[PDB]
């Protein structure tokens, strides 16, 4: 059981003036290899 | 202790205009400290955690960014969480930050974990904001209550016997994990020793072995030190925080060490993004980044 690294994920973009539950762009979610 | 009422009020500002405070009562916060302190002491000082899990770096009182991190990674108990310390100081809302994390710790004691950072120390948070925030919004007595709670925080964690987690880094005094387990709680952070290094030491590319740290506290360590440590304890990765990085995360010594920082636009003096390491059941580590516009 060794440590590996997944693919790069699109970052969740947010605005500081906007509510925490309403990001500008939803970020990527880790998926299977 | 009405934990659900506390969490509810803390999460209530999720869709509100950012910046507004959540003012809990003195007794509610004191209750959070007392119960969490009990759980911290009942659980090992060296945690043995299992994947899947999400690991976060410094938060530093940036409460609304913490909500954004949960908005991205999933609010508990949807996901497991391990924080590497530094929840207070520098930010404008250290109280809201630590209260939610302590509430989640009490609410989900087996799926939510908090490590001790160097800012979870009375001598440190006295200076960099937390004391002033307590004196302003509550009282000095409550600050001492937080101190008594911080002194019982676990120091390190190991994920599936492969990922070693701490706030700072390695120590020249660390030959066996037993030395960490032998550390008695409650305790303050000393100016020197194993406990000091685990919360203060940093990796350094230009250092062969161990060197002096420019902070004036603890040490620096090179890539060879990391490699020897992993091989000796059959580990694959060191996961730490303690240092602000532009992309929110940064590898060291050929992906044998990673630094996590989860506070984007760090106290209005940086344009850095925040990041978070997601570890699945196969110990495959992904990096979820919270990036400012």
Total of domains in chain B? 1
Choose among B7, B60, B1, B10: nearest CA to B30: B1
Q: Which residues of B137-150 are buried (b: 16+ CB within 10 A; e: fewer)?
A: bbeeebbebbbebb
Both tokens of B41, joined, read 């002491």
For A17, name the nearest residue in chain B, comparing CA atoms only.
B18
Contact B116, B153 (CB under 8 A): yes
Asked if B18 lies within 8 A of A16 by C-beta distance, the reply is yes
Q: How distant is the Cα of A3 from the closest Cα of chain B, in angstroms? A: 5
User: CA-to-CA distance for B73 and B165, rounded, in angstroms?
Assistant: 19
User: CA-to-CA distance for A15 and B291, rounded, in angstroms?
Assistant: 9
Both tokens of B85, joined, read 């310390």
Residue B6 belongs to domain spanning = 1-293
Q: Which residues of B touch A21 (CB under 8 A)?
A: 14-15, 67, 71
For B66, name the nearest residue in chain A, comparing CA atoms only.
A20
CB burial class (10 A; 0-12, 13-18, 19+) of residue B45?
buried
User: CA-to-CA distance for B108 and B216, rounded, in angstroms?
Assistant: 38
Asked if A7 lies within 8 A of B17 by C-beta distance, the reply is no
Phi/psi of residue B158, nearest 5 degrees: -120, 125
Whole-number Cα distances in Å, B274 to B56, B137, B252: 9, 28, 18
For A20, name the nearest residue in chain B, comparing CA atoms only.
B68
Both tokens of B282, joined, read 């196969």
Greatest Cα pair distance in chain B: 53
| Residue among A1, A9, A22 minimizing CB distance to B286 | A9
User: CA-to-CA distance for B29 and B145, rounded, in angstroms?
Assistant: 9
Q: Which residues of B are catalytic?
A: 119
- CATH number, domain at B76? 3.60.21.10
User: CA-to-CA distance for B181 and B149, rounded, in angstroms?
Assistant: 19
Asked if A4 lies within 8 A of B282 by C-beta distance, the reply is yes
DSSP string covering B170-221: --TT-S-THHHHT--SS----SSSHHHHHHH-EE-TT-SSEEE-TTSSSEEE
C-alpha count within 13 angstroms, C-beta hemisphere, residue B261 = 21
Paired with B164 in beta bridges are: B158, B238
B58 is annotated as contributing to ligand binding: yes
Contact B40, B155 (CB under 8 A): no
Whole-number Cα distances in Å, A21 to B7, B73, B98, B118: 16, 12, 20, 30
């Amino acid at each position: 059981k060794r440590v590996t690294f997944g693919e790069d994920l699109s970052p969740e973009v947010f605005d500081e003036s906007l509510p925490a539950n309403t990001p500008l762009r939803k970020g990527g979610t880790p998926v299977c290899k | 202790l009405n934990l659900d009422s506390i969490i509810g009020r803390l999460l209530e500002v999720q869709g509100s205009r950012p910046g507004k405070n959540v003012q809990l009562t003195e007794n509610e916060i004191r209750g959070l400290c007392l119960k969490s302190r009990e759980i911290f002491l009942s659980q090992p000082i060296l945690l043995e955690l299992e994947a899947p899990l999400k690991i976060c770096g410094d938060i530093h009182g940036q409460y609304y960014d913490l909500l954004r991190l949960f908005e991205y990674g999933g609010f508990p108990p949807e996901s497991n969480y391990l924080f590497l310390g530094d929840y207070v100081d520098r930010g404008k809302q250290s109280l809201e930050t630590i209260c939610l994390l302590l509430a989640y710790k009490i609410k989900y004691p087996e799926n939510f974990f908090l490590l001790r950072g160097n800012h979870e120390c009375a001598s440190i948070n006295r200076i960099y904001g937390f004391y002033d925030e307590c004196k302003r919004r509550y009282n000095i007595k409550l600050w001492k209550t937080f101190t008594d709670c911080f002194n019982c925080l676990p120091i390190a964690a190991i994920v599936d016997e492969k990922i070693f987690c701490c706030h700072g880094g390695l120590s020249p005094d660390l030959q066996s994990m037993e030395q960490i387990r032998r550390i008695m709680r409650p305790t303050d952070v000393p100016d020197q020793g194993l406990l000091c290094d685990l919360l203060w030491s940093d990796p350094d590319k230009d250092v062969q072995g161990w060197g002096e740290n420019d902070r004036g506290v603890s040490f620096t360590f090179g890539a060879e030190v990391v490699a020897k440590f992993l091989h000796k304890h059959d580990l694959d990765l060191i996961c730490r925080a303690h240092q602000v990085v532009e992309d929110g995360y940064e590898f060291f010594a050929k992906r044998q060490l990673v630094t996590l920082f989860s506070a984007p636009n760090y106290c209005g003096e940086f344009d850095n993004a925040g990041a978070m390491m997601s570890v699945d059941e196969t110990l495959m580590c992904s990096f979820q980044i919270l990036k400012p516009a």
